């Protein structure tokens, strides 16, 4: 239904440091099959010609 509250100071609650939970889980390795790289350096076939006057 309905509820309201005035302007109230909500103080920070008492802080208890947390012990970090520990696990021996081993993250499996990532298997990647591919070239891995993009850009010109990865080109499978390349050709060039300087500025020339068509014969």
């Amino acid at each position: 239904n309905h509820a309201s509250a005035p302007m109230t100071r909500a103080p920070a609650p008492e802080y208890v440091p947390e012990t970090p939970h520990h696990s021996d889980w081993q993250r499996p390795s990532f298997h990647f099959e591919g070239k891995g790289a993009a850009g010109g350096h990865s080109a499978t076939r390349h050709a060039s010609a300087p500025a020339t006057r068509p014969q």
Binding site: G34, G36, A43, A51, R53, P54
Partner: protein
């Protein structure tokens, strides 16, 4: 009772009717053109007074296809014609290209041409009717239009030229050329061919120019009987004394700036010559605004370049008239795309990709002339950083749409038939650098990416953008025109094709005097340029990937 003025004439195998004086009488001119049941209402409104401080001609051409013309209700969710489609934008540029150069220098009044398709005979294409209607309306308006233009579509059936082939004839035709011109000169050529020779394409341009003279004559008669009185427009006064002052001050300096062989140094020196001249002139007389002096210096720089080129001197980048810029071809640049290539020609670069899909991926276009299934898709993106500028991305300007259709036309001639490659192919071009013709680098990159993707194409295709500069009898053909040499294009043409024929030809002539021999010399220099590019392309990849 409304009195319509109707003029009928025979255009090839069709009858064209021009009707004026009844439909839109509050517009500067209005004409209803019909060719064998395909009708386009074309209107022209020209503002009589130019807005103060206008620098460029503001001409707008809007082409609309109305679904009811085909006796059909629109199939969109709102069942109403929406924003201009690609086809409509392209037909609007096909109309805009021939007419823009025919308004006189200094005409900066606003002109809007609106062509609306109101009836369609499935066999008669509305684009030629719309161009004829725009020519008739512009000539009837009394606006300073420098002459009626005509238009024709030429096909190549049984080794013969045919005028305005119907869609059925066009299915068996090896050529689809649209030529537009005046009584004296060809002004526009947008074409697509199945690897035809240069002589065939030039004969087709001549044939269409010869056959559109009946349209030109009929428009002249209509103007002689129903044309409005001509406009009392005079170009703004040219300051001969100021032009002489600026020339005598900066012309020989800029000439010398250009006679040095370093691009960055030159650019600097040039700017210097300017800043110095403008400061000195405004100090002598503060009345003259800076901007006008800057425009006059820019124009003097353009004339200096033009005269250096015409005199046989090297171009702005040190190249001779027939030299192509440096070429780098790389295929396989992207890891997870079916096919990819990077094509660099000097300072113009394109990253082109090819993707293979299934028959469900073909685009179904419901066009005014019928439903059509497109298994080959071409998309061209021209990002702002291609030119070192900031701007808006995604939004495709109209030229960028026209450049993607020109590249698709260039590549379409070598795509395999559906019984040998029943797959859907999408080719996406990304212009990464642009100092020249990005559409032709898109053609070469599309060919490389299609070969990389394993699509069996008939042959590799490349394109070349050329330009012809003419002063009287003297002319020079320039290969691989630069983006800064756009002012030197009395005739700017773009030829695409393979080692054995032409697949796409676009021409935009703005001057008069270009004979057929001149077109022989220009298309022979473009053949040499394209064959050189094709050799460099073949040295990388020569056959589709297994």
């Amino acid at each position: 009772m409304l009195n319509p003025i109707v003029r009928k004439f025979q255009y090839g195998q069709h009858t064209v009717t021009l009707e004026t004086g009844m439909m839109a009488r509050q517009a500067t001119a209005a004409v209803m053109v019909s060719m064998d049941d395909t009708a386009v209402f074309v209107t022209v409104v020209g503002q009589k007074k130019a807005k103060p401080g206008q620098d460029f001609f503001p001409l707008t051409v809007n082409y609309q296809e109305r679904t009811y013309a085909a006796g059909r209700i629109p199939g969109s969710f709102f069942r109403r014609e929406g924003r201009p489609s690609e086809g409509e934008t392209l037909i609007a540029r096909l109309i805009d290209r021939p007419v823009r150069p025919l308004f006189p220098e200094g005409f900066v009044n606003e002109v809007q041409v609106i062509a609306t398709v109101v009836s369609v005979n499935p066999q008669v294409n509305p684009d030629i009717v719309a161009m004829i209607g725009a020519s008739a309306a512009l000539s009837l308006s009394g606006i300073p239009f420098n002459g009626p233009i005509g238009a024709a579509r030429v096909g190549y059936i049984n080794d013969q030229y045919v005028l305005n082939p119907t869609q059925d004839e066009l299915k068996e035709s090896k050529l689809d050329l649209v030529v537009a011109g005046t009584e004296a000169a060809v002004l526009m050529v947008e074409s697509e061919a199945e690897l035809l020779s240069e002589d065939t394409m030039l004969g087709a341009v001549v044939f269409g120019h010869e056959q559109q003279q009946v349209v030109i004559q009929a428009i002249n008669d209509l103007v002689k009987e129903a044309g409005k009185p001509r406009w009392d427009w005079q170009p703004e006064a040219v300051n001969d004394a100021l032009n002489a002052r600026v020339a005598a001050l900066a012309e020989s300096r800029l000439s010398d700036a250009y006679r040095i062989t370093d691009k960055q140094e030159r650019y600097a020196q040039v700017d210097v010559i300017k800043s110095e001249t403008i400061e000195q002139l405004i100090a002598e007389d503060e009345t003259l605004d800076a901007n006008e002096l800057g425009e006059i210096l820019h124009a003097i720089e353009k004339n200096v370049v033009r005269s250096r080129v015409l005199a046989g001197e090297p171009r702005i980048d040190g190249r001779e008239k027939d030299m192509i810029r440096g070429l780098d071809v790389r295929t396989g640049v992207l890891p997870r795309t079916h096919g990819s290539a990077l094509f660099t020609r000097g300072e113009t670069q394109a990253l082109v990709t090819a993707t293979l899909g299934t028959a469900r991926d073909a685009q179904v276009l419901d066009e005014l002339m019928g439903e059509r299934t497109d298994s080959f898709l071409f998309h061209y993106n021209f990002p702002p950083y291609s030119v070192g500028e900031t701007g808006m991305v995604g939004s495709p300007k109209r030229r960028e749409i026209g450049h993607g259709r020109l590249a698709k036309r260039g590549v379409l001639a070598v795509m395999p038939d559906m019984d040998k490659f029943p797959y859907t192919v999408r080719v996406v071009s990304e212009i990464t650098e642009s100092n020249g013709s990005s559409s032709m680098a898109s053609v070469c990159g599309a060919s490389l990416a299609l070969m990389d993707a394993g699509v069996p194409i008939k042959a590799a295709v490349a394109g070349i953008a050329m330009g012809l500069v003419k002063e009287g009898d003297n002319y020079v053909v320039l290969s691989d025109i630069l983006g800064d040499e756009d002012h030197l294009g009395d005739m700017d043409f773009k030829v695409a094709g393979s080692r054995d024929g032409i697949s796409a030809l676009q021409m935009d002539i703005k001057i008069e005097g270009i004979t057929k021999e001149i077109m022989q010399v220009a298309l022979n220099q473009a053949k040499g340029a394209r064959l050189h590019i094709l050799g460099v392309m073949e040295q990388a990849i020569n056959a589709p990937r297994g």
